[PDB]
Design a protein around this ligand. Sequence first.
Ligand SMILES: NC(=O)c1ccc[n+]([C@@H]2O[C@H](COP(=O)([O-])OP(=O)(O)OC[C@H]3O[C@@H](n4cnc5c(N)ncnc54)[C@H](O)[C@@H]3O)[C@@H](O)[C@H]2O)c1
Ligand SMILES: NC(=O)c1ccc[n+]([C@@H]2O[C@H](COP(=O)([O-])OP(=O)(O)OC[C@H]3O[C@@H](n4cnc5c(N)ncnc54)[C@H](O)[C@@H]3O)[C@@H](O)[C@H]2O)c1
Ligand SMILES: NC(=O)c1ccc[n+]([C@@H]2O[C@H](COP(=O)([O-])OP(=O)(O)OC[C@H]3O[C@@H](n4cnc5c(N)ncnc54)[C@H](O)[C@@H]3O)[C@@H](O)[C@H]2O)c1
Ligand SMILES: NC(=O)c1ccc[n+]([C@@H]2O[C@H](COP(=O)([O-])OP(=O)(O)OC[C@H]3O[C@@H](n4cnc5c(N)ncnc54)[C@H](O)[C@@H]3O)[C@@H](O)[C@H]2O)c1
Ligand SMILES: O=C(O)c1ccc(C(=O)O)o1
Ligand SMILES: O=C(O)c1ccc(C(=O)O)o1
Ligand SMILES: O=C(O)c1ccc(C(=O)O)o1
Ligand SMILES: O=C(O)c1ccc(C(=O)O)o1
Lengths: 269, 269, 269, 269
Amino acid sequence: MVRIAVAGAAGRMGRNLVKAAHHNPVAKVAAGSERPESSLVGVDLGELCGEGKFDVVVCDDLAKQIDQFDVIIDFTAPASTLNNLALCQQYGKSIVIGTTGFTEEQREQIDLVAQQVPVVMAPNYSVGVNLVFKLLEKAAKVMGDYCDIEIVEAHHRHKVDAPSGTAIGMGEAIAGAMGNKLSDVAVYAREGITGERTKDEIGFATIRAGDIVGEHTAMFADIGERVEITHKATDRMTFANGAVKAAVWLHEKPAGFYTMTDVLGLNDL
Amino acid sequence: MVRIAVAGAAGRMGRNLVKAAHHNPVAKVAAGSERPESSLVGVDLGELCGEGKFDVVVCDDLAKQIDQFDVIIDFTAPASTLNNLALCQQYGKSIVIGTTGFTEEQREQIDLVAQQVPVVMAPNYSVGVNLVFKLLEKAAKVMGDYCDIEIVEAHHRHKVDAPSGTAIGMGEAIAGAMGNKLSDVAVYAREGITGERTKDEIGFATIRAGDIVGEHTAMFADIGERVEITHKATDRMTFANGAVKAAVWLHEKPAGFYTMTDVLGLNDL
Amino acid sequence: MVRIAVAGAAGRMGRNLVKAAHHNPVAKVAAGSERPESSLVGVDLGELCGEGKFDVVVCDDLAKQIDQFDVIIDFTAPASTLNNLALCQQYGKSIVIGTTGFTEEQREQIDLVAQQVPVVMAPNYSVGVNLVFKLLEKAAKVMGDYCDIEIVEAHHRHKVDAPSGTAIGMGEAIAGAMGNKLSDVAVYAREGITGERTKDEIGFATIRAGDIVGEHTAMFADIGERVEITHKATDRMTFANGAVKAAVWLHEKPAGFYTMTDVLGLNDL
Amino acid sequence: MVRIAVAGAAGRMGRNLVKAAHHNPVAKVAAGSERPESSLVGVDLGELCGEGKFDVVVCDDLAKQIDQFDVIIDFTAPASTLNNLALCQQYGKSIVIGTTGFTEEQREQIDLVAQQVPVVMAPNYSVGVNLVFKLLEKAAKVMGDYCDIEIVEAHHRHKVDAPSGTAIGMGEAIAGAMGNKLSDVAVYAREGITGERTKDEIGFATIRAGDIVGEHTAMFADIGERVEITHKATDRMTFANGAVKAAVWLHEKPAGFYTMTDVLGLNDL
Ligand SMILES: NC(=O)c1ccc[n+]([C@@H]2O[C@H](COP(=O)([O-])OP(=O)(O)OC[C@H]3O[C@@H](n4cnc5c(N)ncnc54)[C@H](O)[C@@H]3O)[C@@H](O)[C@H]2O)c1
Ligand SMILES: NC(=O)c1ccc[n+]([C@@H]2O[C@H](COP(=O)([O-])OP(=O)(O)OC[C@H]3O[C@@H](n4cnc5c(N)ncnc54)[C@H](O)[C@@H]3O)[C@@H](O)[C@H]2O)c1
Ligand SMILES: NC(=O)c1ccc[n+]([C@@H]2O[C@H](COP(=O)([O-])OP(=O)(O)OC[C@H]3O[C@@H](n4cnc5c(N)ncnc54)[C@H](O)[C@@H]3O)[C@@H](O)[C@H]2O)c1
Ligand SMILES: NC(=O)c1ccc[n+]([C@@H]2O[C@H](COP(=O)([O-])OP(=O)(O)OC[C@H]3O[C@@H](n4cnc5c(N)ncnc54)[C@H](O)[C@@H]3O)[C@@H](O)[C@H]2O)c1
Ligand SMILES: O=C(O)c1ccc(C(=O)O)o1
Ligand SMILES: O=C(O)c1ccc(C(=O)O)o1
Ligand SMILES: O=C(O)c1ccc(C(=O)O)o1
Ligand SMILES: O=C(O)c1ccc(C(=O)O)o1
């Protein structure tokens, strides 16, 4: 039984993490924070995610609930996450970090603290996408040399960056497995007279529409046949499920910097 | 009896056009060109498509065979097609144009010449795509105002123009049905920080891979749901049989700009 | 002001219908049922969807709340729906029916009752599917005689009936537009040595997996090409908003069998 | 130099095998069969595939040409393939089997004869499908326990067996990687009231349409996400080149049951 503290439990990710920890039978929702000024401080965590009463409340500082949790799941903001890390060090807790947008200096501090603390830190927690990165590697080794490699992704209308960071992550897994640098081979746009396709290029096609949570397809195309590997994200919940999966696994692990690769056992397939 | 000249008879399309005209008894394979630089000049057209001798040869200039043909079928390159148009004007011939990748100025020239010459011009000669144009119009009247409209197309690695003339044809059908001009709303590339999607934009995504004969998808995406209309082309014969069908039909006709909509009687769908 | 009773309010649809009626300003959530043996009987309707308190409870029989509602919205199970229909007849109420999986005998009954009662019945309450039924008709007239017609649908793991009522709806639209009866041509299972496909058959393929809200594809396949018309449902709110929109529209109306085509004004597309 | 007999050389596969053996410089087209009642009996094999005369004819019985060949390539029908296996046993020949749709009893016979005869048997001779079998094993270990697993396949209108042997091959790879037997968990048809999906079932959906060379998708579906691994076959030459490559490889080998996984050296991927 793993006792989970959800940092910023009112956030978009937070609320999903609470719901996800609730649904995992090996995990217990034990604690939850929000910003001190927030009025959700005091509210029961189950009522927050629309799922009945848990007998736990949102606190304004996880420090205050240290003794009731084993592992912190933290998808908040850089400064907050660094304070939660420091708590782990001090009180012998573990942390699953989902927060992004750290400075280089701050990323260096995490690496240091991860020598004393069990830390999971990943740029994506989807079980399916990480499984897909591995499968792409296998496919690239077998077919990459002689196939045309295309990456196509669809997202909702509000997404401001193209292509997706997950698409770029698929490119890198492929390029790396083939001993290449993605920036050497990547083609992001095709407009007008492009000429004949190059042999080594990895082409990116980007769709922006509706409320699409996230679709990714990597295509390996040969004359005569093609292999398509596709991930569909249906619910921002899936990331939360993965992060909880990671917290369970991280429980009673030694100190170290761990990734989803490690959690899912991708290296030993 | 309709006497057909196949422009660039050695091309991917050209060879299929020859074979298609051969299979239609209302049509006679009468003439065939290639680039002057080519050594195929003097070779027999039937031997070229692997179907026995025809007693017709590939000339380097269709000008030299003007009395042997009624209609030119032209799936080559923009400059070549413009020359063949000029021949039609001067010698009272007809043309079926399949070539894509024209500049707007060049499309304006074709509109002009089509006042004097019977011209069939379509970005796609397949029944299914032309049906699809009509369906897109319906979908656009119902959903187009409040949906995000995305066009995605995949072709084989040798295609030199992006996006496909068929994709542009889908955009025009949709825009026109909504009382808009495609050029106002179209977005052909999405790279880096694009910002939030605009409401009226039609996005184009272009895949180049393998031996793909042709895939098109038009997407109407609302929050909560989407409608996808997809065409898949399996065989270049689909295009070639259509283009020959169009040539036979064009023989009877007066000057004008015609489409496969016209040929197939699909206008009042 | 239209007073809505939501049948089976605890269900996947029921809860979304409650939320949808709540958000529609012309409609009021007035009543709600669940199965008699259920312990949700007595709970406040707003609390079930985490919507706050409504001052309305889940009854075990809509008969008990008859004076509080004008229209029943019913997405439950066949026998339950027939009982609610009976209520409508006896007390001069209207019904919007979403339930699928009725026997032919039962559908004949609904047609009979709909002579005395205002009834909306559709297999799908989304705009996109109802648009799609119209597009299918067009596609069937043009391609249906040459093409092989296949209908493939995916739904979540809990759906109890196959194939979907929406798929059957697509089959009927197609068959009817081609002057056939669906039951003559439909093929619902393919196992073992089936032989060569017949020419007129409409094939049904059913996928059951995960949390899939609903995917439908009608395929028109010819040698050399195919046309695929696809609907993807992303959120049950698409259905629920439509069904509520249908209830509001039904309030004004006399006895009769209506469809979403009627509600949305799509009959003469 | 490996002397190849092509069984049923007139068939869709047979003709492509002839063409493929012709193009492979280590192999020679030595012999070829058709059904005795067939009028292609007597015709030269080269003329059949449209690439000139070979000085080899289509016999009505490979028994008659036994001294001219080392290996039989057999993509015909179950009874025919069993006779050719019997011929291999009697005269010390090898066989590459592509035929699908064997009964359980007949597959046991092939296993027995493969103790005395060098046999390659695979449901798909493509590189991409065999790679896919490996990728499915990976996905099945990571996601198979908690996901719904669905297999969907599309083929041309002439295919006589359902589901595809390749789909059954994907099921077995998945089941086997999860320590299960496919026959325990497979569900081939879903019609009417099926109830809620069981957890462990592998669902098979079969599409028969047009000229589809071959599409396969294996779906791993969890609540919130899914992973889709898809193979598309565009040209029968993919199969034929592989089968010939298998025949060349089989020439050196002793008695045994081999697969493409063996031929391609993919077992440790
Ligand atoms: N696939 C993924 O791995 C994935 C998916 C979504 C988001 N993210 C990451 O998660 C982070 C935030 O997620 P979001 O934008 O959906 O949620 P959000 O920004 O809406 O919520 C952030 C929450 O953190 C809380 N917070 C901030 N300071 C705090 C403090 N001192 N104490 C307690 N709580 C505090 C906020 O009050 C808020 O509730 C981002 O860095 C983002 O990069 C990752
Ligand atoms: N509208 C349609 O339905 C349709 C279908 C298929 C292809 N296309 C388009 O048609 C064009 C041809 O495509 P392809 O894939 O067959 O290309 P391809 O390059 O195989 O064929 C082009 C041929 O045209 C020839 N050519 C060029 N200039 C010439 C000249 N002056 N005289 C004679 N021949 C000349 C070339 O020598 C070559 O043989 C492309 O623009 C493509 O986009 C259109
Ligand atoms: N037309 C559409 O747009 C559409 C959309 C979704 C679902 N459906 C159909 O609607 C029906 C229900 O779907 P669901 O996924 O929401 O199922 P569900 O099981 O989640 O919900 C059905 C609810 O009805 C309740 N119920 C059963 N018997 C009852 C009774 N006698 N009195 C009161 N309540 C009772 C159940 O207890 C349950 O809460 C199905 O038949 C489905 O095929 C139609
Ligand atoms: N394993 C694979 O990679 C793969 C790939 C494609 C097709 N197939 C399978 O291979 C088989 C052949 O498919 P197809 O599309 O080529 O079928 P087809 O009907 O086109 O060809 C079968 C041929 O075998 C011939 N034949 C039948 N009985 C014979 C006999 N007793 N002696 C000699 N010839 C005989 C037929 O006359 C015919 O020409 C099918 O079972 C199909 O599922 C397997
Ligand atoms: O137009 C033809 O079909 C054509 C022209 C010439 C021949 C032939 O030699 O068979 O066929
Ligand atoms: O629509 C097109 O542009 C189109 C259709 C077909 C091709 C091609 O094969 O290059 O290009
Ligand atoms: O058309 C249907 O039957 C349909 C649409 C949605 C559902 C469901 O969720 O069960 O069923
Ligand atoms: O896996 C198969 O059964 C298979 C693969 C290809 C075909 C066919 O073309 O009939 O059948």
